[PDB]
Design a protein around this ligand. Structure first.
Ligand SMILES: COC(=O)Nc1ccc2c(c1)OCCc1cc(-c3nncn3-c3ccccc3Cl)sc1-2
Lengths: 121, 989
């Protein structure tokens, strides 16, 4: 009975952590898919800007070139923001998965004890 | 994967009024745009392409029309937004960004897959991603059911399509019980037929007094006679009117989407039968067949996208346990671990359980062959290996898993196999879990155990029926007949001794003459013996069909064999009415969980019926959709929902509207339960009002079909009547107008309580049981009136409750300054029903109260207060809140009413009559006990904690006195019944 009050409380943390972990896993999945899209955007920038950079270089129009650069820099900086936001989540997931293991280790110590008592009682 | 929330952004329930959206242009440019959260993609695109003119490479961009927006959803998938009518807040965006792309493939296909994926609650591309051949084979082969169903909808093209959309909601049998016939005078009904006459769309009525057995066409014929009587037409021309126009018209219930499209008698129609009962005038609306047929669209269905024999194997079963990659054990407490195994047929073992050697948890390697005392030939089709990694502290399982020893292509499983294990359930005391999910955990981030099966000469396949029949065809007294008749009558929970088991098997050939004993005979077979099973297979092949209610039991956990299940399905295919299939759909959905493989005769049957009748289709959708959170059923139900959504026609668009509405509701209630949690009702209401007023909500929640009953169109929201209920969990009382032209003649209001937080499956099941009990009583000719109100679970502890118009709890009426005596309820009824109406009201009270007194006793519904028992103005009593040694209950408050106001309420002919209703009702339910037992037993597989074992079902065995005689049961019940305000707030003394 004493151990049943805590095993039941422990399972309540096992279940939440499991839910929360599955959420983080799909958020990381969404971050990868977001990162892939932004990378795909850079390939699109190089493809189109190639013939504009080329014309302006053959024209000494250093501003219009630096203008195409400032926007590419913005796009590039944003990919760093997303990659660093994904890493922050990755390490949070790692910390939580470490917790749902220690919740488990705790449970698999109480569970064989509780089983012996229910039989005795 | 499916979305965690109903939020507008990941981790954000509600996006601000104005938000910054990163726009990724097709020229490789990034533009930050500030948008209103309620802004449509049309507006955002226009706003963007205007702004884009300011940035480099603007000259490359073609017209806004030439592009589409793409983003990543909270479901972690790349969505293409074709419908640019959708608002920023309603795209389930992961991060606030949008990409501009040139649309790629074919619109039609991508659009449908978007619409399917949304309704299911997971993208279709995820099914395409599954490499499992059984999944892909299910996807291709189920289309045969879709194509067959779509073909019957188009055979007799106009009527057949209307028949699918508006199936006659008619009673079981055309035969009326005499107590109901006596209500309609001279065996005739006064009906009112309305017409919306043009110009100015004015209403015109025609009252008709005709027989109840009248086909709707005869009802139209008599109406066209009433109209033509003044025309001076000759007898021959008058007859020709009826002859040519008798069926150029259709009948509809006023203020409802209920149509009288089939040849059934008028009284058989559920609307009409309730009117006959209630003494109400049936209001019908006449219409042109073409007026209805112009509404019907769809039916645009498009298609997507060496052997050796088992028991030629002279060997005992061998299974090699190899390695188990990790286990989370406290090495200080648990040193050794072992793999416990067992070969099972359902929940019963085929042989004694075999363990591996105890190993140190630091090295979970066994590389051991396990020897089972069973020959390979004796393995039944449905045999399974049930295993678990157990600890030695004193034993306990750590992780569990089950596998079918044969695959869907009848191939005996051979070779190496990795099995991702499932966590042990809370309260699973047993070392193994055979009535668990047979399959490897879709979560690969779990303990996985490698396995190895014997590899015989070539490919091992389960024998053909020709082979089985040939092996079977190779391998009566007076008291004996009485003994078989005794076993037959016994409820499915009554234990049959090994002596009785031997007796049934030894008399198996006679058993065919008493066919309703098939479930008792099937439990007497040694499933671990091919000698017995082959003989049983032959008996089943030529077994006479049994009632659907009997055949349903053959689909629960006790009957895993495919031949048994096949027979069961064939009985339902031959005898189950659409009325009754709708009545047992909850159980029929759960019982799919017990099927070994994805593609089976039960799924194929249920799917065809759902794609054949939209009433069935609607609830088949919602029942499956509600369980899309439970990963133990996510794939099977997901694949099933995909096949339904692909072939249901235009209904998928209505289903998407209902899903959209529910998603907003779940999100608004989550906000009230979480962020706003600690706010006063006053404050929370101001927020609710602000929120519901917003365009997106007004769009989402107005003008859709009630998920509780699609025949009810939910029009414009009556915001003044909408509120957050004072109770905990924050339920939403929502009120909608009735958009029907004749909304005045049925119901002008549509009230629903939306409740997020509580599991509504208990309530849902009890309300179904109540409906069945009423149908048993009403069929037997016992007017006992029940109110099985609408209740639907739409997901994980989210659901809807139908608000019963003109009802009050006994508590509410007691508070009508605030002085109540046990006479208060009677005084209330006396006042609400003055005159000759009084007698009728008191009668309705006694008939309804009697039904509820018996139902609640039988089921064991306790915690009954004056705040969970309600009474309609007409006098009808009914109970509410069914989330759960319960005796008979009859308050002096009720007694006073029953006894029309008398001081000695036990010594009246009223109470005598009442007691007679209770006895008759109780004995009627006891006679149909197997049905109730079977319905609850089909519910063990579902996650319902109140129904986890047969021991939980054993309560009805007690209240119905099933081991007792019928006179001993009557005596018991009569005893329970005869056994039977100041501080009503807390109850002290
Ligand atoms: C007309 O005046 C009224 O007060 N009507 C009314 C109120 C509540 C219900 C009802 C007519 O219809 C019957 C169905 C029903 C069912 C309810 C229920 N079921 N489970 C929990 N509840 C519940 C109880 C109290 C408050 C809210 C809820 Cl959802 S409440 C309810």
């Amino acid at each position: 009975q004493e151990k049943s009050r805590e095993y039941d409380r422990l399972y309540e943390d096992y279940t939440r952590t499991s839910q929360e972990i599955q959420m983080k896993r799909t958020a990381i999945e969404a971050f990868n898919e977001t990162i892939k899209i932004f990378e795909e955007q850079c390939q699109t920038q190089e493809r189109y800007s190639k013939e504009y950079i080329e014309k302006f270089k053959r024209e000494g129009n250093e501003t219009e070139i630096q203008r195409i650069m400032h926007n590419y820099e913005k796009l590039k900086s944003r990919i760093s923001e997303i990659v660093d936001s994904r890493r922050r989540l990755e390490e949070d997931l790692k910390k939580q998965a470490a917790e749902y293991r220690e919740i488990d280790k705790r449970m698999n110590s109480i569970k064989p004890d509780l089983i012996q008592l229910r039989k005795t009682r | 994967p499916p979305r965690p929330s109903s939020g507008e952004l990941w981790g954000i329930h509600l996006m601000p009024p104005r938000i910054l959206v990163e726009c990724l242009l097709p020229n490789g440019m990034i533009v930050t745009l500030e948008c209103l959260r309620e802004a449509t993609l049309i507006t955002i695109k226009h706003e963007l392409f205007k702004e884009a003119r300011k940035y480099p490479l603007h000259q490359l961009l073609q017209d806004e029309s030439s592009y589409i927006f793409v983003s990543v959803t909270q479901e972690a998938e790349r969505e293409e937004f074709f419908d640019e009518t959708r608002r920023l807040c309603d795209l389930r965006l992961f991060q606030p960004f949008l990409k501009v792309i040139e649309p790629v493939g074919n619109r039609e296909e991508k659009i449908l897959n978007r619409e399917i994926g949304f309704a299911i609650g997971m993208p279709v591309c995820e099914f395409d991603m599954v490499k499992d051949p059984e999944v892909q084979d299910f996807r291709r082969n189920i289309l045969n059911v879709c194509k067959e169903a779509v073909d019957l909808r188009d055979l007799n093209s106009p009527h057949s399509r209307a028949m699918y959309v508006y199936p006659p909601n008619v009673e079981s049998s055309p035969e009326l019980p005499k107590h109901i016939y006596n209500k309609l005078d001279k065996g005739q009904i006064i009906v009112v037929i309305w017409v919306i006459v043009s110009p100015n769309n004015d209403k015109q009525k025609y009252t008709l007094k005709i027989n109840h057995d009248c086909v709707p066409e005869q009802v139209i014929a008599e109406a066209i006679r009433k109209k033509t009587r003044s025309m001076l037409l000759s007898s021959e021309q008058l007859k020709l009117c009826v002859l040519e126009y008798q069926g150029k018209y259709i009948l509809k219930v006023c203020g409802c989407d209920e149509y009288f499209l089939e040849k059934y008698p008028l009284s058989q129609y559920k609307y009409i039968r309730s009117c006959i009962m209630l003494g109400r005038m049936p209001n019908l609306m006449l219409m042109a067949k073409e007026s209805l047929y112009s509404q019907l669209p769809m039916d645009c269905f498009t298609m997507p996208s060496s052997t050796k024999s088992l028991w030629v194997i002279n060997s005992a079963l061998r299974i090699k346990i190899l390695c188990a990659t990790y286990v989370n054990v406290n090495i200080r407490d648990i040193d050794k671990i072992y793999v416990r195994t067992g070969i099972y047929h359902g929940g019963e073992p085929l042989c004694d359980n075999v363990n591996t050697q105890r190993v140190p948890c630091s090295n979970p390697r066994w590389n051991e062959w396990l020897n089972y005392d069973i020959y390979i030939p004796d393995l039944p089709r449905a045999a399974r290996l049930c295993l678990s990694i157990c600890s030695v502290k004193e034993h306990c399982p750590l992780a569990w898993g089950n596998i079918n020893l044969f695959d869907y292509t009848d191939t005996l499983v051979s070779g190496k196999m990795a099995l991702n294990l499932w966590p042990v359930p809370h309260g699973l005391e047993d070392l193994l879990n055979p009535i668990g999910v047979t399959g490897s955990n879709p979560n690969k981030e779990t303990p996985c155990l490698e396995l190895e099966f014997d590899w015989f000469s070539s490919v091992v396949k389960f024998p053909d029926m020709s082979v089985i029949e040939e092996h079977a065809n190779w391998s009566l007294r007076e008291n004996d007949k009485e003994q078989l008749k005794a076993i037959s009558t016994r409820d499915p929970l009554s234990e049959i001794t090994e002596q009785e088991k031997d007796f049934l098997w030894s008399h198996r050939h006679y058993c065919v003459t008493i066919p309703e004993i098939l479930p008792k005979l099937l439990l007497s077979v040694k499933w671990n013996s091919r000698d017995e099973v082959a003989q049983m297979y032959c008996l089943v092949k030529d077994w006479p069909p049994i009632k659907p209610e009997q055949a349903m039991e053959l689909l629960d956990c006790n009957y895993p064999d495919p031949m048994v299940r096949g027979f069961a399905v064939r009985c339902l295919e031959k005898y189950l009415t659409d009325d009754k299939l709708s009545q047992y759909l909850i159980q029929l959905v759960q019982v799919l969980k017990y099927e070994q493989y994805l593609d089976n005769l039960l799924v194929r049957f249920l799917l065809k019926k759902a794609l054949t009748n939209q009433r069935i289709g609607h609830f088949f959708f919602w029942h499956l959709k509600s369980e899309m959170h439970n990963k133990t059923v996510s794939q099977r139900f997901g694949l099933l929902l995909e096949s339904y959504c692909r072939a249901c026609g235009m209904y998928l668009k209505h289903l998407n509207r209902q899903v959209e509405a529910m998603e907003k509701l779940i999100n608004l209630t989550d906000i009230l339960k979480q962020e706003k949690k600690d706010e006063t009702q006053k404050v929370q209401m101001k927020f609710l009002v602000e929120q519901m007023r917003r365009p997106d909500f007004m769009d989402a929640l107005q003008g859709f079909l009630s998920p509780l009953n699609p025949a009810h169109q939910l029009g414009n929201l009556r915001l003044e009547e909408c509120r957050i209920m004072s109770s905990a969990k924050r339920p939403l009382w929502l009120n909608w107008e009735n958009p029907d032209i004749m909304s005045e003649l049925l119901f002008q209001n549509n009230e629903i309580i939306f409740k997020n937080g509580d599991d509504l499956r208990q309530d849902m099941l009890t309300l179904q049981i109540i409906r069945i009990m009423e149908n048993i009583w009403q069929n037997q000719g016992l007017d006992l009136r029940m109110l099985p109100y609408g209740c639907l679970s739409i997901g994980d502890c989210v659901g809807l409750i139908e608000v019963v118009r003109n009802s009050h709890t006994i508590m509410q009426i007691q508070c009508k300054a605030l002085q109540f005596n046990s006479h208060t309820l009677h005084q209330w009824l006396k006042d609400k029903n003055k005159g000759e109406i009084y007698d009728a009201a008191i009668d309705l009270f006694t008939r309804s109260c009697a039904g509820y007194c018996v139902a609640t006793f039988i089921l064991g519904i306790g915690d009954r207060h004056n705040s969970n028992i309600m009474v309609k103005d007409d006098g009808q009593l009914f109970h509410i809140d069914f989330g759960h040694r319960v005796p008979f209950v009859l308050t002096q408050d009720f007694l006073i009413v029953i006894s029309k106001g008398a001081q000695e309420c036990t010594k009246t002919r009223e109470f005598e009559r009442f007691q007679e209703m209770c006895y008759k009702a109780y004995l009627a339910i006891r006679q149909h006990a197997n049905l109730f037992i079977n319905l609850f037993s089909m519910m063990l597989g579902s996650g319902m904690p109140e129904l986890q074992s047969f021991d939980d079902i054993a309560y009805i065995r007690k209240t119905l006195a099933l081991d007792k005689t019928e006179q001993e049961a009557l005596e018991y019940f009569m005893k329970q019944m005869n056994d039977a305000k100041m501080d009503w707030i807390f109850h002290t003394i």
